[PDB]
Amino acid sequence: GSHMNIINTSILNLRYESNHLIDLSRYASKINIGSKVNFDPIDKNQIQLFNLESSKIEVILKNAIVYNSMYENFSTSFWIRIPKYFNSISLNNEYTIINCMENNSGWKVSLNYGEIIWTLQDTQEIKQRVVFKYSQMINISDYINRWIFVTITNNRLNNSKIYINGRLIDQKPISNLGNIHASNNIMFKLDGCRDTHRYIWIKYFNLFDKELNEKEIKDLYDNQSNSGILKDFWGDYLQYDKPYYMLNLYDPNKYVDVNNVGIRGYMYLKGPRGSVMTTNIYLNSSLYRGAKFIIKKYGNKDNIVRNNDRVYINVVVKNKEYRLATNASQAGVEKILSALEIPDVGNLSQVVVMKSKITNKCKMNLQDNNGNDIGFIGFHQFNNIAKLVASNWYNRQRTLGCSWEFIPVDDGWGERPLLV
């Protein structure tokens, strides 16, 4: 199916190209970057903004697009990755991250504990806010510290809408506001944040001169999620030669562990996860638990794992890496996976095909040395021991048995991993 390119239409398209962050829109609005504005060097569209004065991005809008009107529809979209709030001083502390306000007229995006806020204000001090709330008192969150797609649409005729991942959260009336005259510049900065450690990750910001509808919003979302590159749990590019704690989506409360190494031994799912907490601030399931998977290349320079890549999967027991493998010839379709000492793996099937898909969560499809399909790596119960296996049952279609998540240690989750 075809559809109309909404992005090249936008009146501001902030992106990294060449070695600068620049606007790709007609109007080529000027962009001032702060000293301490860090760019992710694996994907330089991903911008980090700290709670420092010198950490900011200033977009000097062209006069023609600067907003001054009672009637003109406008929308905005950006992906944000927000760290878990760690400090009590963040409990009622609204702070703005994206500012377009003059004399109290304009629009701004701001955050607070558990919240994303779109605020609108007219020149008569009349205002509306629409708001996304998320809890930090939750086993596993879709939102805490994971890349989320944010869309705001404004129709002057009636409503302002906020969307998280192309899903309508909240809409409020705004037909009462009058002339909202905004700023000449858009400022990306953390303004009024008491947490001196607060920072956000932000990518793919876009300003539109219309009110995006559902389909257009979902089109954006699907296309910018970049299927074909697998993601880790936080949504960053999945990488080779990088250790990950693992999560199964049929049973998120368990973690992978191995009883013993070698072909005698097996790898299984062990629960429960346990919980990580800060008094009055958060209470979540622990994520840094179990064996660790490391993905190994079996030609691109990029350390990036792509859809259909062929890889070997290492397992970390006691700070030593062994190989994931199995004997395809063993009884029954479900083939029990083991963690073999790498130089003793011989003929055992070990080559895995990574999968992204339409779209789907991460998958692993184990293969022989002839490229035959052993099955997607999931698990199965053998007298209530949930051994990791490989079954083509999964393929031939509880299909959450083979859907996995790869969790690196991220500075915005805060947890202390138990080490050996």
Binding site: G274, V276, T278, G414
Partner: protein, 91 residues
């Protein structure tokens, strides 16, 4: 008066601890019997395979500490604050 960077398994008995700071300490296999901590801070400590009998933490702040394989239940903590604390295998 404050202690740091140590590992212990021996079990101090029937003691009252008040106003102590333990930075980076390992409490490995230790069996607390009638111990009380008061006004104390645990920074990046680790409790592994500990048991506690008639033992209590009163107005204590744990920061980035791991409780692995313990018997610590909520009642053993009296007006105490946890920051960045993980709890792993509880018996």
């Amino acid at each position: 008066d404050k202690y740091a960077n140590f590992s212990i398994n021996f079990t101090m008995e029937n003691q009252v601890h008040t106003g102590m700071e333990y930075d980076n300490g390992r409490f490995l296999g230790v069996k607390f019997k009638s111990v009380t901590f008061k006004d104390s801070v645990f920074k990046s400590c680790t409790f592994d395979d500990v048991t506690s009998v008639n033992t209590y933490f009163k107005n204590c702040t744990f920061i980035d500490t791991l409780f692995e394989n313990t018997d610590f239940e909520p009642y053993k903590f009296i007006d105490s604050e946890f920051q960045n604390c993980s709890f792993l295998h509880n018996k």
